[PDB]
Design an enzyme around this catalytic site. Sequence first.
Site, short mmCIF file in Angstrom:
data_model
loop_
_atom_site.label_atom_id
_atom_site.label_comp_id
_atom_site.label_asym_id
_atom_site.label_seq_id
_atom_site.Cartn_x
_atom_site.Cartn_y
_atom_site.Cartn_z
N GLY A 154 59.33 33.46 56.08
CA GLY A 154 58.17 32.59 55.98
C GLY A 154 56.92 33.21 56.56
O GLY A 154 56.99 33.84 57.60
N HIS A 199 43.11 36.39 51.17
CA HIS A 199 43.75 35.43 50.27
C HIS A 199 45.22 35.21 50.66
O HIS A 199 45.65 34.06 50.85
CB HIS A 199 43.70 35.94 48.82
CG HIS A 199 44.40 35.04 47.83
ND1 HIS A 199 43.80 34.00 47.17
CD2 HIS A 199 45.70 35.04 47.42
CE1 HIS A 199 44.71 33.40 46.39
NE2 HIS A 199 45.88 33.99 46.51
N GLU A 200 45.97 36.30 50.79
CA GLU A 200 47.40 36.20 51.13
C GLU A 200 47.69 35.49 52.43
O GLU A 200 48.65 34.71 52.51
CB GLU A 200 48.06 37.58 51.15
CG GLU A 200 47.98 38.37 49.84
CD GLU A 200 48.34 37.54 48.61
OE1 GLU A 200 49.21 36.65 48.70
OE2 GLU A 200 47.74 37.77 47.53
N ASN A 259 49.93 41.35 38.98
CA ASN A 259 50.03 40.78 40.30
C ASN A 259 49.72 41.84 41.35
O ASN A 259 50.29 42.94 41.31
CB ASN A 259 51.40 40.17 40.52
CG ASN A 259 51.58 38.90 39.73
OD1 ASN A 259 50.88 37.91 39.96
ND2 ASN A 259 52.45 38.94 38.73
N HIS A 281 61.81 44.40 45.40
CA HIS A 281 61.88 44.65 46.83
C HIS A 281 62.63 43.56 47.60
O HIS A 281 62.18 43.08 48.64
CB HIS A 281 60.46 44.88 47.40
CG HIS A 281 59.50 43.76 47.12
ND1 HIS A 281 58.81 43.61 45.94
CD2 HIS A 281 59.16 42.69 47.88
CE1 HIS A 281 58.11 42.48 46.00
NE2 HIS A 281 58.28 41.88 47.16
N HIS A 309 47.90 31.78 52.32
CA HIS A 309 49.22 31.25 51.94
C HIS A 309 50.14 31.27 53.16
O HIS A 309 50.87 30.31 53.41
CB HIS A 309 49.88 32.11 50.85
CG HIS A 309 49.26 31.99 49.50
ND1 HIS A 309 49.08 30.79 48.83
CD2 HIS A 309 48.78 32.94 48.66
CE1 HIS A 309 48.51 31.05 47.64
NE2 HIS A 309 48.31 32.34 47.49
N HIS A 343 46.44 27.23 46.20
CA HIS A 343 45.25 27.70 45.49
C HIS A 343 44.10 26.74 45.35
O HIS A 343 44.27 25.53 45.44
CB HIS A 343 45.62 28.24 44.12
CG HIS A 343 46.37 29.52 44.18
ND1 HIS A 343 47.50 29.80 43.43
CD2 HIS A 343 46.18 30.61 44.96
CE1 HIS A 343 47.93 31.02 43.78
NE2 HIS A 343 47.16 31.55 44.71
C1 LIG Z 1 40.77 38.61 36.83
C2 LIG Z 1 42.28 38.63 36.59
O1 LIG Z 1 42.98 39.90 36.88
C3 LIG Z 1 42.75 40.67 38.07
O2 LIG Z 1 41.59 40.90 38.44
C4 LIG Z 1 43.93 41.26 38.83
C5 LIG Z 1 44.44 42.50 38.10
N1 LIG Z 1 45.03 40.31 39.02
C6 LIG Z 1 44.88 39.13 39.62
O3 LIG Z 1 43.83 38.76 40.14
C7 LIG Z 1 46.04 38.18 39.50
C8 LIG Z 1 45.79 37.30 38.27
C9 LIG Z 1 46.96 36.64 37.54
C10 LIG Z 1 46.41 35.99 36.27
C11 LIG Z 1 48.01 37.67 37.19
N2 LIG Z 1 46.20 37.36 40.70
C12 LIG Z 1 46.76 37.82 41.81
O4 LIG Z 1 47.28 38.95 41.89
C13 LIG Z 1 46.76 36.88 43.02
C14 LIG Z 1 48.25 36.51 43.23
C15 LIG Z 1 48.43 35.46 44.32
O5 LIG Z 1 48.19 34.27 44.12
N3 LIG Z 1 48.89 35.91 45.48
O6 LIG Z 1 48.99 35.11 46.48
C16 LIG Z 1 46.25 37.59 44.28
C17 LIG Z 1 44.78 37.51 44.72
C18 LIG Z 1 44.14 38.85 44.69
C19 LIG Z 1 43.97 36.53 43.90
CA LIG Z 2 50.65 44.89 40.34
CA LIG Z 3 57.92 35.04 59.27
ZN LIG Z 4 57.71 40.24 47.80
ZN LIG Z 5 47.62 33.27 45.82
#
Ligand SMILES: CCOC(=O)[C@H](C)NC(=O)[C@H](CC(C)C)NC(=O)[C@@H](CC(=O)NO)CC(C)C
Ligand SMILES: [Ca+2]
Ligand SMILES: [Ca+2]
Ligand SMILES: [Zn+2]
Ligand SMILES: [Zn+2]
Length: 163
Positions: free
Chosen positions: A91, A117-118, A79, A67, A121, A127
């Site tokens: 940003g 969470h997002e 993700n 995207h 950031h 984190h």
């Molecule tokens: C328990 C593990 O697996 C799961 O439950 C699900 C499927 N995946 C995840 O939690 C993955 C885990 C990674 C290891 C890929 N993490 C994220 O997608 C974060 C990305 C981030 O940091 N965004 O800012 C977003 C937030 C929701 C935490």
């Molecule tokens: Ca995904």
């Molecule tokens: Ca912006």
């Molecule tokens: Zn993106």
């Molecule tokens: Zn994150």
Amino acid sequence: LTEGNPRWEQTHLTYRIENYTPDLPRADVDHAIEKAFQLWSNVTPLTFTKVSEGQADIMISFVRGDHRDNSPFDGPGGNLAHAFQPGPGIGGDAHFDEDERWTNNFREYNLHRVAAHELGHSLGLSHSTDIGALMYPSYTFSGDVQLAQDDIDGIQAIYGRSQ
Ligand SMILES: CCOC(=O)[C@H](C)NC(=O)[C@H](CC(C)C)NC(=O)[C@@H](CC(=O)NO)CC(C)C
Ligand SMILES: [Ca+2]
Ligand SMILES: [Ca+2]
Ligand SMILES: [Zn+2]
Ligand SMILES: [Zn+2]
Ligand SMILES: [Sm+3]
């Protein structure tokens, strides 16, 4: 120019939901995003105002696959979403993977929980190692979405406290 993460120097920010996910009714998406902003707003002097047209500090969208940025999404699982640190243009923007099934209940994956969470950031936070914190790198749903002391300390270290 100092160390640490980039922060917003403005305290009153605007946000805009660019497109909606067909997974949930419009009102539930608005609610999930508004509640997420409220959490961080409760402990800092930051305020957020939603705009329907034009550019805003934090743009939110639901996208899939490639995207226009360097981290294309991966389909269901993996993700779930990503966001950019504070700064002009892109940003602060948050992108949610549309290939996920977004919910407004305890089943995977709760939008409100992921948005909280997002936005952390988007506000300049990195984190946390605390498994009870919203900023933990993996998704967890306890049944309620609230800031852990770790989240509160991290945001207050940047923008200070409220009241
Ligand atoms: C328990 C593990 O697996 C799961 O439950 C699900 C499927 N995946 C995840 O939690 C993955 C885990 C990674 C290891 C890929 N993490 C994220 O997608 C974060 C990305 C981030 O940091 N965004 O800012 C977003 C937030 C929701 C935490
Ligand atoms: Ca995904
Ligand atoms: Ca912006
Ligand atoms: Zn993106
Ligand atoms: Zn994150
Ligand atoms: Sm979906």
